[model samples]
Target: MATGDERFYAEHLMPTLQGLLDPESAHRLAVRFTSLGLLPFQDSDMLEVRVLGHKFRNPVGIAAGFDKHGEAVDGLYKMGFGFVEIGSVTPKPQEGNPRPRVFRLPEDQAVINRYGFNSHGLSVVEHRLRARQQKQAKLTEDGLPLGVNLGKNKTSVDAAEDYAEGVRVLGPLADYLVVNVSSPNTAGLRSLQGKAELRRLLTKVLQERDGLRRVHRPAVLVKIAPDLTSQDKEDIASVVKELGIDGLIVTNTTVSRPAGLQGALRSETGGLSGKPLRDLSTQTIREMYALTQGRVPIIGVGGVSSGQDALEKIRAGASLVQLYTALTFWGPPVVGKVKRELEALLKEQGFGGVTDAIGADHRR
Candidate 1:
């Protein structure tokens, strides 16, 4: 059942707020609103998950790009996210692409962003993380897994070194670290997904991560582009298996435009995310599961806006799920909605929990 506050925000406030500002500006406002210590709606622990040495109340997480600078980690946690990933942060601050970089296709319930990893860099982000850590960093009050999505600077001389630096500096603070090399906005960024380049990059990152003076090393995952070829998926699966990377985020947003996109911004140049991206991402999760023989855990993300969508991804073989664009349409309550509905779906299907449901479609 929808609370009055949830209904008011999702139905009335969000539409009016979105109508008044551009996408990026609207995002900033959301960040500011979240930063003010807004309490999060709580979900029943019916979807609890244990992965990567942490306990998640639910599998739904806030994907990177929503809180690029780590400004609202606590607030996002307060909003019921089981995990919050921040950054795509670089070694140095970057301004990213020019204005009009993010577009909302309301008609399509999608977003096109070429923000190009606009970030405040590691120093600021690390400070906040350290401060948070100093405050006891409970994995239970809003005690969710906190991840950092590492990205290279636009003009870096060496991409691998940039990723290695991210591991050296931020790995200790992160519950997990994402090596994000698939954003289409950055020139040649996706090229890092090549088997050779990816192997080299992960080697550097893992070496740095392993050498850290910590009791528990953060799990390192890779974020890949959705526009991968069959061979590309095979190659990536092979590399990840060989290197023993912690997991794979099934996709970043995609460059390919699907059919029936009905909006002026559909033609806009950037990664397309939202309803249009759901099938492709879920299909990729299924394929990757087959390729890895379910060996690698996948965080399915693309257009997950509902519990059914999240459950579909899990059945398709995702160990977890993430969302960003859907928040534009559904508001914060979407987290609790997805969890409650997933719990029901799990019950209706005669499954035990998230674990029993994961990869069920691929088992036989």
Candidate 2:
């Protein structure tokens, strides 16, 4: 089931790579390696899930920020991802936060990143997507879903305008578009998560999307933070429902410092993403699922690293699940491992498939 290279990587663990190179440097290599092939992908009818006008062979996907520039998607698809999300791309290119901004907490299976929204910006990214579109941009090969996550420039005076521009430029080329306002690294970014700002932001984004004269219209989704208040959650649900957004990415990384984070970098200043984020994110999904009354779909991401973890998100009300740190900690085969474990768990739980299990906790 595992290739020799995959087995070797899995056995050796991330520490080996992180040891050989610092986390950020290793991250670039990770992307580079992923751009090549690793695992032979498997797509099962049992894992089939349709979301945002695309059919995912598996509900497992790599979340945004993994391939920030849309590179290595084919390689990631080859490694068994059902879908790949690219960019938290800003309207204009930005340098983001300073160097030494990424930390790997191997002890906690976590990462703290303050990379801000360092992006290639719209023009460069747009050129690539346009060029790829000529080659047929749809992931008809080994990929099923391709999403573009949009963000504002660090110095942006007009956040709404930034997102509106992203929708105008990138929306037409994507299966779905994300309005990312949750990254803690960006000042005033999370402030947009408030109900008032969210409503304004989505309204403008939707207007641009609706105005797009195109053959394909991408679903517009909002990526929110896990560090939300009770009011924040309620308002977000109310706003999305009122505004008629296509979906919600239940969480980005978190700024909260959960207890038992046993690592030297636990106190680092940035978003903490990994096992520590799992329960927090799932709880958020459960609440959002209830708040939306299952009317709006959720793509659950945070700390999912295993099949059981993926199922927990689904049971808690996620239609799809995504992971980033897990791929780094466990290697590429983790993708197949997640799908396989999820399939067996679904059968064990008498889940005919993943669809029925979504929001199961709510029903129970």
Candidate 3:
């Protein structure tokens, strides 16, 4: 049944949508499907994860900002994602940067957006989460995890304060909390990557993360940018290991416009994601794994449009991986495409479990 859906989406929906709207509108319309309950929800034993002490049904997860307000997680899970990460929430809701904020480079199979952390206010999203929990009682699926990704409001002047505040308000509800200082959409947010700034931000959030839990603390992970210097990667690797952070999502998007678009969109402001980022993201993952010696878990994301693309990251040193732009062009069925292809690749390599494949390139 899932396989058939994949064929139909690839044959009909993918081509039609790609021919029509600009990249940003395509994303909004996809999100609208979740709002309209058009996404699928078939359960399968194939999706099962046990990362960060909690178990997930599968390895594929929808990245943040896709469900910025947590409005459509139930529908998303129905579409066969393992878990859903929602928000890049601000203390107060702002309408985002402005329209035309999100642009796509179809020739390059990429997207660039500087939406500026536009989000529904934390209070509204909190109430919505609480209401949704009450209505559903458990996760949309029996044991699926619902994570909330946090960021500062556009008006936040002292950015660390914004991180602390987001941690304070959003800590309790998220099964896990991701501190997102890496998104290119936000002005100066990436500056939080410095050693001193990173420590202060993660310290406050980690402290709050543990405080919010009665039984167990939610896993706290940090997402970092792909356009880092070697020095930047070293600083983050040390900070993460020293802080004992649970995980790291190695990349957000690259600000650099790599040459050779051929016939692509020439001018757009914001981070570049998708095919152009493939080599860059893989490099980031390899560098991170080298710096840490595979000690801490990493969730790799960026330019993941195919199963082989994702498997490359895992082989380079990712415990799990995520995708965004790929879905923008291919539709939800790409999730299954990735997983099925990955499973075959693993078997061919004589690996019994997916985790065993992490850093196949790393020296023992």
Candidate 4:
């Protein structure tokens, strides 16, 4: 359902926009246009997969950090994303790290952002989703899944309390909820991934999640950082298993600056995403998959710029895939391209559907 001009802007006009606006400004433009309904839906039965108690027509989703305020949920639903996850939303309005916080690495096809969960907070977003529902079809009626990623305020000291507040408020509105503790920009947030901390935090989150109406209770998933010590992964897997949490989003961006990064950008503060993240992120997925013995579903993200990249993540262990940095580079059409190429690749491997290839790398 994508129109020619839409594709045209994705391919051509994007460069012009790139020349005009800074990366952050361009990202703002993307959300605004998506809010205005510029991108259209695209899907096929072959790509459908069920997870988190719902069916996603395709595995491709827009990663959370992009739509922090829920401003463009409807347009994104129409933009061919099987699901759209908005936020790293905080319990209170947050003005994350000061400006010039996002930088581009054109040569490396990457973005390093320290936006640090800058958010319009809960009420603003809840009101927007509520308003959208009033104006259009029910959020889930269209089969376009919605996920809300929750974050703590920059000054919040009680991590568990922050997440519980998030669960109580947005949990009812989401297909699934994410406790995004992996962002590098958020001070000491990743420390919560430790065994004791993770169990403590997630237990509270789950307890609150259970308080929701038994029906339509959203699944709670933890998004982990790619940079993890051996003890961290083992600890996280143990907590996940013991707690029986709903799932995992394989990674948030990496703080480790990898080789081949161009210029001073690599040294820039914040998380780095895009091509440089491909193998590193997939390896994390593979590790977490093995750690959990594929018992938990993984939503793979990080440098997913192509179909092969997405396939590699699926083969490594992801059930669904989400992307953001790629959107910064290739724009929305990248969603359709990934789906088309992935379908072609799946058939070439003799798989009937995307789900058939999940964790295929570890099989006979």
Candidate 5:
């Protein structure tokens, strides 16, 4: 029998130190870990999630930033996550902010990173993604949903144009699209989340989406910062409701921490994510649940390291979720474990279905 303490360490601590000395090395080894499938194991019937006009075999997915270039989706899928999001790709490649950019706050079960949209640029990413998509089409093995998270280039002449360009190049191949207006690591990036700016950017992208395919319009999601006040969340929710967007990614890495964390990584300059993000992130999800009234789906992310946490997010109104920092702290088993625990939680709570449990807390 697995106790919470044992599960927590195996799920969180072991993977973090696998290559702590070198950031790039750590990333490569992590990818290799997924390929080996060394994490916890499970066969799931309760992990399904339907969003963005598609079905995910499981609600747990690898968030973007983990595989900044979409190079590891096949490996990640082998580890049991139901979806994978990659890229924060820009039109022109940038080396990202700098080294010491990713820090581990093991004491807090969190990570501080300012990788700053480090990517190999859209052309390289587009070619790789197109090749992967083509290869997948040939196999038709039916893996998890795959999507790209688009971001503006650091020095782009027009940020919106950068995103639009990415959409033009990569949209057809992705299962969905995410406009990342969050991520405090980048200067002036969050400003794009402003109602006027966001709507304008999204309008262009949505218009671009409209022009893309006659068979279907890929769902577009806006990832928001988790630091918003209730009033701010209300305002953003209103815009989403107004825009008729497909969904919102509730809660992103935060600049705030509750304190008592004394570690080398704690003071690193970047957005924070991990177990520490739970309460505030869940609060954000709860508030969004209240405001959106389930009108728009929510992909709750931030600090979800366990099944109970995932269940709570679901009850708070998350139709789906994605995690990276948690997987960084734990290992890939966190994915399968969260899914299994959620199934047990749902059964214990007498929730008839995962879809029905979404926003159940809101109703009460």
Candidate 6:
């Protein structure tokens, strides 16, 4: 039932591969192998999901930063992810931070990275996206939603215009667009999350998205940081509603390292993700769900590693969920595993579908 690549990786490869290469090298290696048709593809009627006017084969997705260049979009989809979000792409190609940017913390089942918004720029990613669309209409034809995450160039003069331009150029190709104002590695990027700036930014991007002369306008979602004061979250929810933003990715990695994280890598400077982030992100989802009245769909990220974790996210208010850190530890099979577990849990709880389970916890 398992693809050779999938079976081998979990049985023999991962145990040896886990610690041999450093974090960044390992990531590159995984991408290369995926390119060689080594990653397995699996699908089922059971995991189909409908949201944001598109149907996803499953709810679990690979978060941005893993396939920064959009090179492995199809490969990832084959690996059983319902969706794959690519890029923190900028308007112009730019080099991110220096080497030693990504650090692994196996002990904590986490990672820390300050990769900045290092990207291949809009043109390159857009070309690949167009090709993917042509190669497999399924990617763009409602079989699976392909999301493009847009970020501001580090040297940009006007951050809001940068996002607007991204929508104009990439929006036509994307099933959904993520206005990534999170990412701790990007200087002043998070500032856009402020009430006044966010309103201006969202207004500009939304205008561009609607104005596009395309057959379909991709849904736009904003990604916010995990470390925010209560006021910050409220302000964001209010702005998202006022401006008609389509969705929200509840929390990115954290700037604050929680106590009891046990490792030297804990001192590394970057957003922390994995187990420690689970509770914080979930609570943020609960609060944002309350603030938004469950009107805006929330894509829960940060520290999700299992089906139980995904269900907790859905119950807290997430309409969908994503992961990257968990793949580093569990390998690609985690996608199918999470969907299986979530399906069982949904049935056990007497829920008919994923939508039935969404925000169930908050309702209680």
Ranking by lDDT: 1, 2, 4, 6, 3, 5
Which has the better TM-score: candidate 2, or candidate 6?
2
**Model 2, poorest ten-residue lDDT window?**
134-143
TM-score of each: 0.96, 0.96, 0.92, 0.95, 0.91, 0.95
Model 3 residue pairs with clashes: 40-78, 40-79, 41-78, 47-57, 47-58, 48-57, 49-56
lDDT at 176, model 1: 89
Give the 10-residue window scoring lowest on summed lDDT in candidate 5.
134-143
Sum up the clashes in candidate 4: 0
Residue pairs clashing in model 5 are 11-330, 12-329, 12-330, 47-58
Tell me how candidate 5 scores on lDDT. Answer: 0.78
Clash number for candidate 2:
0
User: Per-residue CA lDDT of candidate 4, range 1-364, in tens?
Assistant: 3553446755677777888999889888888888898764357777989888887878999998888999888787676788889998898998998899999887888889999889999888877777765343354655567899999998997988999998988887788999998999988899999888899899999999999997648999999999999889999999999999999998899999987788567899889998888888999999999999999999999999778999999999999999988877777778878888899899999998999999999996
- For model 6, the stretches where C-alpha displacement exceeds 4 angstroms are 1-12, 40-46
lDDT at position 187, candidate 6: 88
Candidate 3 lDDT by residue in tens digits, 1-364: 2343766776677768867986667777888887777763343443355677676666777878788888887887777677788988888888888787887776788878888877888998888887776443366245577778888877777777777677777766777778898988777888899899899888877877767656435688898888998898999999999999888887788888888964355467788888888889888999998898788777788888777887888888887787878877777878778878777777787777676778888954
The positional error of residue 247 in candidate 3, measured at the CA in angstroms, is 0.8
Give each model's whole-structure lDDT: 0.88, 0.87, 0.78, 0.87, 0.78, 0.86
Using TM-score as the yardstick, the better of models 3 and 4 is: 4
The global Cα lDDT (0 to 1) of model 2 is 0.87
Candidate 1: where is the Cα deviation over 4 Å? 1-6, 39-42, 140-143
Clashes of 6: 1
Error of 4 at 5 (Å): 7.3
Task: Please provide, for model 1 over 153-224, each residue's C-alpha lDDT reduced to its tens digit, 9 standing for 90 to 100.
Answer: 999999999998899888888888999989999998898999998899898889989998775479999999
